[PDB]
Design a protein around this ligand. Structure first.
Ligand code: ADP
Ligand code: ADP
Ligand code: ADP
Ligand code: MG
Ligand code: MG
Ligand code: MG
Ligand code: MG
Lengths: 75, 104, 525, 72, 156, 77, 106, 151
């Protein structure tokens, strides 16, 4: 009836999806917090290696698709 | 007031004006909705209060009920409602005068 | 034998042909389909169509104009192409009658199909139709009434014609206001026929009744940075000069020096030349200057220092309309200030229409050029209003050129059919049947007009036919209630030119289509 | 279906039924000149009407009660 | 009168019903973004661009609607934005409700020309009523200006 | 004999078959009545009424209508 | 409810023990405060069965006829002899007719 | 709305539906095509037809009989099927009239198409045709002459 060429999510579905995306982004970097935190080891699918603990660098290097997860990355 | 005006008319135009008023009741129902209120009861209370003469009675979301809204400082200029009504009526009239779709 | 049904094949791949029965079947099917599509948008109670383009942009168009409906449709039937080109040529000749002529041609071809089914040679049908067309044209010419001598009666006829033309379109909601607007706009042309002197500006927003005909003129251009935004008792100079890095037209010329000081001197000389040109322009004693081409920064500030408005990039239509409305002369040389006439108007200012700003010319001297602001709720509404206003202006201009008028509401069609029947009643052979079919189509036109309103079309057409046979030559359809009435009293009139063109073009297209007995298609590219 | 105007005819018949107490006034589908079905001998079994109303009500109740669809 | 004219076509009725259904679907789409308790919609275009907005005109024009009635409603919202600048959702919902009522009006056996004239009469009466409820205001009163601005921003 | 795929259409088909089996006449009136009931329920739902309450009101009105039918019924020999 | 506590790394055995203790306490409380009538009154027993059947039925599509169907169910169950076997209660579905047309055959 | 022209699809894949315009158009086209095909084989000066089978046998037969012409053709138009069954039943009841009945039905349906175009409800057409059939049958019966007495 709406005839919009796309996919529509409404109600608790989209809210839960956004919260899940934000939770995934948080869980990626949650293990690098505090003195007992540990660094990560990023590979750029061509052999380039990056070892870092900085959250900004980790979130910048990752390629993210979900808009809310992006929002957290630019945050 | 448009329900009253329709009652002052006769024929099919009375039915059309009644439908017009019942369609105007949609926005108050939507305002009652989205706020956790019961749309039917809130709209009926709006209609009753306006029938009693309360011209400024409106939906009060701060108190979750109905009250005067001029004391709630909820006002918009006339050339918003007037423009919306005029443009919507003109668009509906234009759409009604269509009876075929041709693929170019 | 035949090319297609022969043991040896004479064609390349993809090329075929259709013999007599098949060609006639395809032509009649295409014509009837076109007529059925274009009809139901006919008369005061006709609906509109939605033209949803299948292209990349998917243009959306809601229209009642038959010519525009037939223009933007993918047509492969060649007879349908003939009818479409008929409608386009009818639109080019006069503004109205496209749906009428298309429906008349379709009904004529339907009657031709019936006659062919009744074992009648098409040449007999063509001869009978030629005779019937002659009779109908003579009757319509004898029925014309002229009121151009009387000013008030001619004005009343113009109002009636504009109302009749706008009755079918979307503007029927405000028919009175739009009729007054169109009549005033046409009358302001002072007899000139160039509709390009009438500019229609479509601004979104506002009710359709907010449209108005400006008392002066409106321009959608801008003003220089340091120039006045409002002048009184304007003396306007309209020009077509460059004033943008103006080069001497010797294309082989160049600056060839041996020092940068000489280059600076030549640059200063160029700026001095531009300043001298601006001074020569100012020698005319002007307040506002309008140039067709661009105006660069240096002449812009030169005009600003002199306190002179400099409207730039007003295209050929813009400068022509300004010359028409103000009386100025489009000048390209400024060595003879006394040989150039300056346009004059009482006030120039900037008005606020919608969210846009326009230049308003008020109290124009000549005023033989109009601008019409159309306000609507949707882009489709604006486009349809512009098309309807164009139709009304075209018909009014045709009536101004030729003041002969005929009565509408099917009265002209009924009179033509009566004359054709009278001619056919005194003719032997099957040509009488052909003329009877001609009359049947002519009567079918108001029959469809009545069907579109939901009335009892058969009864109304019978009453109209009886009234015309008795002697009531002004009887016509009254769509206020759904009865027959006097078209003279009720004020439904049409231009004689439009009806004559509709009749003749429909007869011509029916004749040319009927003569075809074989359709041969080449291999598509 | 009979070509009459639906709303006008129904309103007139309803007004006639209210004015004069006569539950036999219906639609003159065959244009016999009278709206009274008793003389027109239009007769329906009471069981049929009761079954119609009951079955329609129960089916509507089910359709209203459904709120999810899980087609493959 | 008798049987009367017979509607041979039945296709114009289908077109009218389809247009009304499209308009009502558009209104139901932008129905939850109305009032101080409304919420915003996230729209992702063909590219990766993401828009979070409550403006009705922006929501309507940001998503391709592919239906002529829906496109005309989008143009209606654009025109309301041009003339007014707010109330772009209310006008679309009003148009959708009017067409939804037109569904039952047409089904009752009313020609879609009496409906248009009756709607024009109702619009004129409503304009009179709205003007009657109006209160004069001058720009010197800063409190009314602030209240209007706050009411406009309440839903964002 | 109608080839439908929508489950609600199948429910309509089964309703018609049920009316035919129980009575044998009125198999077309039931579908029209159900469609009208659901059409009215649509605009009732749009105003924020729980569908269960609509069903309960429909049941109450159906009981009233059945009682009225019994009241105005007439006997034949 | 226990997902957050899991997320800080709480030992699952503690959660399991807490659930077991809480469930034991809840079951004991239910057995303690449950209302029972030790009068063996046939009319009171029938009323209790009918009320329980109505409560169990007032969530389905037959909730409008819940009292009538509950009366059928109680009457049907009371005629089973000692084992209350389900196969001794026939369920026949015949298309057509309203719910009020449904009957229990003695 | 309509069963086919609705936002939700209520049909299986391949199922179709034609409303008043399309149904009447297809019925009239099929009936008129059948009538035109079977005609020209009517009257003393009627001509024959060649029926070429497309199967393995490729059976060849020439005939002037309307019933046999209508039997051995692949027909998809349902109204054409109605007329073919009419011709077959007419052949079963009596030996002749197979072409005449089909032509009469086709002409009647063409006139019905014209009447529908003239905005006439088909029920009125049916009632008028019932009255006309009664009158025509009465006239034909009154015109009958019997000679069974004299040998
Ligand atoms: N008020 C009216 N009363 C009766 N007939 C009218 C009226 N207005 C227009 N008509 C008729 O409608 C016909 C079609 O006009 P219109 O649809 O506006 O343009 P076109 O001639 O291109 O179809 C005209 O031939 C005219 O006779
Ligand atoms: N504080 C408030 N209390 C009650 N109603 C409000 C309040 N603020 C706004 N509204 C109402 O909400 C309606 C919708 O406004 P909004 O959601 O901004 O969209 P739009 O401006 O496009 O109508 C307005 O008609 C207004 O009357
Ligand atoms: N000698 C004849 N003179 C005039 N008409 C004839 C003659 N013979 C047959 N007919 C007409 O030809 C019509 C068609 O008959 P025919 O083609 O034999 O088969 P069918 O009766 O099945 O159409 C009949 O209705 C009959 O009236
Ligand atoms: Mg015209
Ligand atoms: Mg706002
Ligand atoms: Mg029956
Ligand atoms: Mg024979």
């Amino acid at each position: 009836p709406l005839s919009v060429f796309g996919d529509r999510s409404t109600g608790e579905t989209i809210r839960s999806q956004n919260v899940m995306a934000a939770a995934s982004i948080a869980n990626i970097v949650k293990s690098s917090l505090g003195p007992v935190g540990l660094d990560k080891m990023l590979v750029d699918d061509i052999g380039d290696v990056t070892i870092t603990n900085d959250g900004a660098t980790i979130l910048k290097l990752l390629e993210v698709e979900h808009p809310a997860a992006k929002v957290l990355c630019e945050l | 007031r448009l329900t009253e005006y329709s009652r002052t008319l006769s024929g099919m135009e009375s039915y059309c004006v009644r439908a017009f008023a019942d369609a105007m009741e949609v926005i108050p129902s939507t305002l009652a909705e989205n706020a956790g209120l019961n749309p039917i009861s809130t709209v009926t209370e709006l209609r009753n209060r306006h029938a009693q003469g309360e011209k400024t009675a409106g939906i009060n979301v701060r108190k979750g009920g109905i009250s005067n809204i001029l004391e709630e400082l909820v006002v918009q200029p006339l050339l918003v409602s007037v423009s919306a009504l005029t443009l919507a009526t003109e668009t509906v009239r234009s759409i009604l005068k269509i009876d075929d779709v041709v693929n170019t | 034998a035949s090319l297609s049904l022969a043991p040896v094949n004479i064609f390349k791949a993809g090329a075929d042909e259709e013999r007599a029965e098949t060609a006639r079947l395809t032509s009649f099917i295409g014509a009837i389909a076109i007529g059925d599509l274009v009809k139901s948008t006919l008369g005061p109670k006709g609906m509109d169509k939605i033209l949803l383009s299948s292209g990349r942009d998917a243009s959306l168009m809601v229209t009642n104009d038959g010519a525009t409906i037939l223009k933007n449709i993918g047509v492969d039937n060649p007879a349908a192409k003939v009818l479409v080109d008929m409608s386009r040529v009818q639109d080019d000749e006069v503004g109205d009658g496209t749906t009428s002529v298309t429906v008349l041609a379709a009904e004529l071809l339907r009657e031709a199909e019936s006659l062919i089914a009744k074992k009648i040679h098409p040449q007999t049908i063509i001869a009978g139709w030629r005779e019937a067309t002659k009779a109908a044209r003579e009757a319509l010419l004898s029925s014309a009434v002229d009121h151009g001598s009387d000013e008030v009666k001619f004005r009343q006829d113009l109002m009636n014609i504009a109302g009749t033309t706008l009755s079918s379109k979307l503007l029927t909601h405000h028919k009175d206001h739009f009729t007054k607007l169109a009549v005033e706009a046409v009358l302001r042309l002072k007899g000139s026929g160039n509709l390009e002197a009438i500019h229609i500006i479509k601004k979104l927003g506002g009710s359709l009744a907010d449209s108005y005909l400006d008392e002066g003129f409106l321009l959608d251009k801008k003003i220089g940075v340091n120039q006045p935004k409002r002048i009184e008792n304007a003396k306007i100079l309209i020009a077509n000069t460059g004033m943008d890095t103006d080069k001497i037209k010797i294309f082989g010329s160049r600056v060839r020096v041996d020092s940068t000081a000489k280059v600076a001197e030549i640059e200063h000389a160029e700026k001095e030349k531009m300043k001298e040109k601006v001074e020569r322009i100012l020698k005319h004693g002007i307040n506002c200057f309008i140039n067709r081409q661009l105006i660069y920064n240096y002449p812009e500030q030169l005009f600003g220092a002199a306190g002179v408005m400099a409207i730039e990039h007003a295209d050929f239509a813009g400068v022509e309309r300004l010359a028409l409305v103000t009386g100025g002369e489009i000048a390209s040389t400024f060595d003879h200030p006394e040989l150039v006439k300056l346009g004059s108007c009482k006030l120039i200012e900037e008005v606020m229409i919608g969210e846009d700003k326009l230049i308003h010319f008020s109290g124009v001297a000549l005023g033989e050029a109009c601008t019409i602001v159309l306000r609507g709720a949707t882009q489709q509404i604006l486009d349809e209003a512009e098309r309807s206003l164009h139709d009304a202006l075209c018909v009014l201009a045709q009536t101004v050129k030729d003041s002969r008028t005929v009565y509408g509401g099917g009265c002209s069609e009924m009179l033509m059919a009566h004359a054709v029947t009278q001619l056919a009643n005194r003719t032997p052979g099957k040509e009488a049947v052909a003329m009877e079919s001609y009359a049947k189509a002519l009567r079918m036109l108001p029959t469809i007009i009545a069907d579109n309103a939901g009335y009892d079309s058969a009864d109304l057409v019978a009453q109209l036919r009886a009234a015309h046979s008795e002697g009531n030559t002004t009887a016509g359809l009254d769509m206020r209630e759904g009865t027959i009435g006097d078209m003279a009293i009720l004020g439904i009139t049409e231009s004689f030119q439009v009806k004559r063109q509709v009749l003749l073009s429909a007869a011509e297209a029916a004749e040319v289509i009927l003569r075809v007995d074989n359709i041969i298609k080449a291999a598509p590219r | 279906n009979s070509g009459m105007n639906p709303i006008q005819t129904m309103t007139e018949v309803r007004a006639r039924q209210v004015k004069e107490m006569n539950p036999a006034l219906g639609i003159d589908c065959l244009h016999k000149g009278t709206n009274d079905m008793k003389q027109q001998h239009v007769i329906e079994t009471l069981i049929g009407k009761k079954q119609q109303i009951s079955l329609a009500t129960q089916m509507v109740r089910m359709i209203l009660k459904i709120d999810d669809i899980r087609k493959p | 009168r008798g049987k009367g004219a017979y509607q041979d076509r039945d296709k114009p009725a289908q077109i009218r019903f389809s247009n009304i259904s499209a308009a009502k679907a558009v209104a139901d789409a932008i129905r939850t973004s109305l009032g101080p308790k409304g919420m915003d919609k996230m729209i992702q275009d063909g590219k990766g661009d993401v828009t979070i907005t409550n403006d009705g005109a922006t929501i309507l024009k940001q998503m391709q609607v592919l239906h002529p009635a829906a496109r005309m409603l989008v143009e209606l919202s654009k025109a309301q934005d041009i003339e007014a600048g707010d109330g772009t959702t209310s006008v679309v919902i009003i148009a959708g409700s009017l067409l939804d009522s037109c569904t039952k009006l047409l089904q009752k056996g009313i020609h879609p020309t009496i409906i248009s004239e009756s709607f024009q009469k109702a619009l004129e009466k409503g304009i009179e009523i709205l003007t009657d409820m109006s209160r004069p205001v001058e720009l010197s009163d800063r409190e009314t200006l602030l209240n209007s601005a706050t009411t406009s921003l309440n839903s964002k | 004999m109608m080839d439908v795929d929508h489950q609600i259409a199948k429910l309509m088909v089964e309703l018609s078959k049920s009316q035919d089996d129980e009575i044998g006449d009125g198999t077309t009136g039931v579908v029209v009545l159900a469609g009208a009931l659901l059409e009215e329920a649509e605009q009732l739902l749009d105003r924020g009424i729980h569908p269960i309450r609509i069903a309960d009101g429909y049941e109450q009105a159906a009981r009233v209508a059945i009682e009225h039918l019994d009241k105005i019924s007439d006997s034949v020999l | 409810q226990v997902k957050p506590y899991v997320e800080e790394g709480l030992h699952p055995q503690i959660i399991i023990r807490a659930f077991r203790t809480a469930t034991q306490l809840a079951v004991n409380k239910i057995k303690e405060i449950a209302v029972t009538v030790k009068k063996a009154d046939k009319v009171e027993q029938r009323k209790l069965l009918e009320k329980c059947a109505m409560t169990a039925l007032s969530s389905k599509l037959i909730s409008q006829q819940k009292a009538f169907f509950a009366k059928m169910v109680v009457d049907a169950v009371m005629m089973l002899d000692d084992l209350l076997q389900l196969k001794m209660i026939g369920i026949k579905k015949v298309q057509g007719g309203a719910l009020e047309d449904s009957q229990l055959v003695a």
